[PDB]
Amino acid sequence: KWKTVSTIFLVVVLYLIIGATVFKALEQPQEISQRTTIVIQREKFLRAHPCVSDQELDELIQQIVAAINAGSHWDLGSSFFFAGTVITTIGFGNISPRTEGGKIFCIIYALLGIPLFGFLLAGVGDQLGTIFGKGIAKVEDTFIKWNVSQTKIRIISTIIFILFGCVLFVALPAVIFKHIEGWSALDAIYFVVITLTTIGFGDYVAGGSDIEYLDFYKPVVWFWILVGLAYFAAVLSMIGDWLRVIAKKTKEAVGEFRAHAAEWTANV
């Protein structure tokens, strides 16, 4: 009978409004400057080049906009990488089907692909989930039977998972992307988190930005994605579980606050 959805809905709508205000506060400033720095650039080109005028430039800019539709791509290895983004749902979009057929196939390819991949990822996670189990198996004896009791060890263990997991699937792959791909420390981490969360803006793509890389680099990447996605899968789930606790902790802390405020009121 009880809905319980509206409350979570509003928290989400609230979580969005807070986000919106923070993003425009952070991004719109640099927007304006770049939007001014772009105006300075057009006039510079027309002034520095009597060869070009208002008429020629408008025509040029319009064709480069048409180039935005496309930008060799769709090669033997790119389309394979494309299909990867589809079944995983990341969908960087940097390369997408421009053919009515490539779209219909993409539609069919996704409806069938996504469910398929889930089975693989489901097994990949299950497999690594037990691998982690073996690792923490010897960790639950050495310094567990010793001083600290069992109820509080469950925290030390979870910290080892995130700490260690963030190194293998976040730190190391970001460090490699930094050198090989030429990205910064934040951009690398930014890419990893955006990629392994299946968001995939497409602003940063390890396969893209090509003047430098080898066919050994790109396979290990998609495998990284395969394995890393399972990591955030549990990480995202745990973070989701932490919220469930805080949701009940706050729900009983609010019950505490009236129970004592009611007490307090009845004194006269």
Q: How far is the CB of 93 from ligand CCCCCCCCCC (least distance, A)?
A: 20
By the 10 Å C-beta count (0-12 exposed, 13-18 middle, 19+ buried), 202 is classed as middle
Q: Which CB atom, from 27 or from 141, has the smaller least distance to its own copies? A: 27
Q: To 10 degrees, what angle do helices 172-181 and 217-265 make?
A: 130
User: Please, are residues 252 and 140 in contact by the beta-carbon 8 Å criterion?
Assistant: no
Place of tokens 């064709």: 63
The type of residue at 81 is F
Q: Which CB atom, from 91 or from 153, has the smaller least distance to its own copies? A: 91
Q: Which CB atom, from 1 or from 152, has the smaller least distance to its own copies? A: 1
Place of tokens 């389309």: 79
For K ion, the binding residue among 78, 79, 96, 198 (CB under 5 A) is 198
Structure tokens, 249: 């902790």
Binding residues for ligand CCCCCCCCCC restricted to 164-223, rule: CB under 6 A: 168, 173, 185-186, 189
Say which entry of ligand CCCCCCCCCC, its own copies, K ion, none residue 165 contacts (CB below 5 to 8 A, set by partner kind): none
User: Please, are residues 103 and 73 in contact by the beta-carbon 8 Å criterion?
Assistant: no
**Chain length of the chain:** 268
Structure tokens, 198: 């299946």
Structure tokens, 226: 């395969």
Binding string, residues 205-244; x marks residues near its own copies by CB under 8 A: ------------------------------xxx-xx--xx
Q: How far is the CB of 255 from its own copies (least distance, A)?
A: 20
199 binds its own copies (CB under 8 A): yes
Instruction: Find the helix or strand (DSSP H, E) in which 229 lies.
Output: helix 217-265
Binding residues for its own copies restricted to 24-83, rule: CB under 8 A: 24, 26-32, 34-35, 38-39, 41-42, 45, 49-54, 56-58, 60-65, 67-83
81 labeled binding residue: no
77 labeled binding residue: no
Binding-site residues for K(+): 89-92, 198-201
